[PDB]
Amino acid sequence: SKNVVIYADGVYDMLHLGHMKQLEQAKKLFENTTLIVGVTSDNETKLFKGQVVQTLEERTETLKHIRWVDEIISPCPWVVTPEFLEKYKIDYVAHDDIYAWLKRAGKFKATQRTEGVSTTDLIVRILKNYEDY
């Protein structure tokens, strides 16, 4: 079976079970894959998206411990382009319309989120040990 190059990008701040399940999903889109993960830069994430707790290095060092991750691009460009797909020989981009052009080209694969698992939900759990009054 021929090997399919998958690309997923993101911030990956404070990696949690939700990111990992999403990565596993991208990885298993086909029988034989190379999952490339792109990690968005500090400055671009803050300017375009919002607050980010961990640096590029920290967010990238953590992703290297995830079993689904074959290759990393860090930092990755903030906007994926057809030229980017050609230079890394990416066959599909995996994400959860700036993706119209990918869909239009047959190169878009959906993955899912899962809520209530983010490292913020868990601090709520911790604080619940202190009832009001």
Add this chain to the structure above:
Amino acid sequence: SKNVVIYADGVYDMLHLGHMKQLEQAKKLFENTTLIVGVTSDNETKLFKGQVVQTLEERTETLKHIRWVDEIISPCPWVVTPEFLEKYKIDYVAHDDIYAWLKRAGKFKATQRTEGVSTTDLIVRILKNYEDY
């Protein structure tokens, strides 16, 4: 090269880069290994060790996404015994003296911690955006 079975156990609450580096260390103690990870039960961790945020399931589902982890035992017994080593054919236990007997038997391998990486250190980072006064 013969395959060496390594066992490391722990709570693995709110998995962070520090747990992962420790697991990678156990995994690479030898050229060819099977890393078995034991995950301590909810009740025993709370009674003997202290507060725990995530359940057994949550802490165990997360470990399955770490690339260094070959097998999991969940829950694992709170105290490792020579009988336990025999039943799982463990050659070495990896940890960072209840370990005297392991050292005495040639079956103990040290791994290291690394500080300032725990999911609590990072909430401090977040709060620093709010100076006092």
